[PDB]
Amino acid sequence: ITGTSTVGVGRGVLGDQKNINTTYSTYYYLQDNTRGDGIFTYDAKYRTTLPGSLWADADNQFFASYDAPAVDAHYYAGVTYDYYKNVHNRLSYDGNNAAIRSSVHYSQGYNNAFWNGSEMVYGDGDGQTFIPLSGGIDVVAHELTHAVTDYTAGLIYQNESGAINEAISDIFGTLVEFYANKNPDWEIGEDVYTPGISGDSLRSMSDPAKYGDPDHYSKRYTGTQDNGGVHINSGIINKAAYLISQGGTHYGVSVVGIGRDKLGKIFYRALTQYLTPTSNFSQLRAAAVQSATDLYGSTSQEVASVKQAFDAVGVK
Ligand SMILES: [Ca+2]
Ligand SMILES: [Ca+2]
Ligand SMILES: [Ca+2]
Ligand SMILES: [Ca+2]
Ligand SMILES: [Zn+2]
């Protein structure tokens, strides 16, 4: 919509107060004109017809519980935008400041969130397994990273390339959580998962096996469920990225950690320069090694750590 850029205030899903960039034209809309060609948040109104209506508010105050998921979708989209721009010099998901669009209140009791090829979509959860999914910065950045992958490597969403596509989203979703720096960790979705249970999440990068995911290639899932295990086998790559950043000994193989910033650089470079739609795990290892070599040199600690991390998870 055409109007003036304004600044509203509201509460997110977890009761935290924040400012949001809005646009004024009769109503105050969730339209942030300060980043690229806009960040736009819509109301799906418990339906599945997308995008729904551009979110409109009478007074620029967003404190109703109905407002909360839209507050977070809009705000965390802006944080993720800032991360890619400030850290990777990437403008929006296509690298050309494409508008970022999100719809919240999708369906009824919908325990999931996803990128549909054109926009972000968040359920409200059923209140037991999930609360509104946009309350998790790692969930928002996970899903926006799928848009990044779709415009770069284009990793096919099946089998090994699919598990890479998943891992990449877990990695950058986690690096975005650390960038925003509110209770960061190496688990996925903990802020919005199971409000009755402390300390759990959907997935762990530091210990995939915690939730039944493989942490070594010899444990890969080779069946047909979950598109050949894209959310299951990502554990192998998640563990490798955790090792590259943090270090550790995993099945007897020791890895020297190089930290989050370097992990982010190496994997962003692999994603955007080396990976292709059909890349398998072994080709990921070569891309990450070539990335680390470009960035730090072939004799570097960084290259040696990438090789050790992939050895530790059984990927040659
Ligand atoms: Ca209001
Ligand atoms: Ca956290
Ligand atoms: Ca997390
Ligand atoms: Ca929980
Ligand atoms: Zn995903």
Residue at 1 is within a domain = no
Residue 114: alpha-carbon gap to chain centroid = 10
Residue at 241 is within a domain = yes
The experimental method is X-ray
Residues 143 and 181 placed together within one structural domain of the fold: no
Is the Cβ–Cβ distance between 214 and 235 less than 8 Å? yes
Residues 202 and 279 placed together within one structural domain of the fold: yes
Instruction: Tell which of 104, 119, 154 closes a domain.
Output: 154
183 annotated among ligand-binding-site residues: yes
Residues 135 and 92 placed together within one structural domain of the fold: yes
DSSP SS3 for 171: helix
Q: Return the amino acid letter for 305.
A: S
**Candidates 74, 105, 119, 143; catalytic one:** 143
Is the Cβ–Cβ distance between 24 and 6 less than 8 Å? yes
CATH number at residue 277: 1.10.390.10
Domain count, the chain: 2
Residues 274 and 293 placed together within one structural domain of the fold: yes
| DSSP E strands, the chain | 4-11, 17-25, 27-29, 31-32, 39-43, 53-54, 56-57, 61-62, 100-106, 113-115, 120-123, 187-188, 203-204, 248-250, 253-255
Residues 125 and 175 placed together within one structural domain of the fold: no
Instruction: Tell which of 132, 154, 176 closes a domain.
Output: 154
For residues 212 and 110, what is the distance between their CA atoms, to the nearest angstrom?
23
Instruction: For CA atoms 258, 263, 265, 270, give the dihedral sign.
Output: positive
In terms of residue numbers, what domain contains 148? 6-154
For residues 241 and 231, what is the distance between their CA atoms, to the nearest angstrom?
15
- Whether 119 is a known active-site residue: answer no
Residue at 229 is within a domain = yes
146 annotated among ligand-binding-site residues: yes
Residues 164 and 147 placed together within one structural domain of the fold: no
| Declared resolution, Å | 2.2
Instruction: Enumerate residues with CB within 5 Å of ligand 3 (an ion).
Output: 138, 177, 185, 187
Q: Sheet holding 4-11: strands in order across?
A: 56-57, 27-29, 17-25, 4-11, 61-62
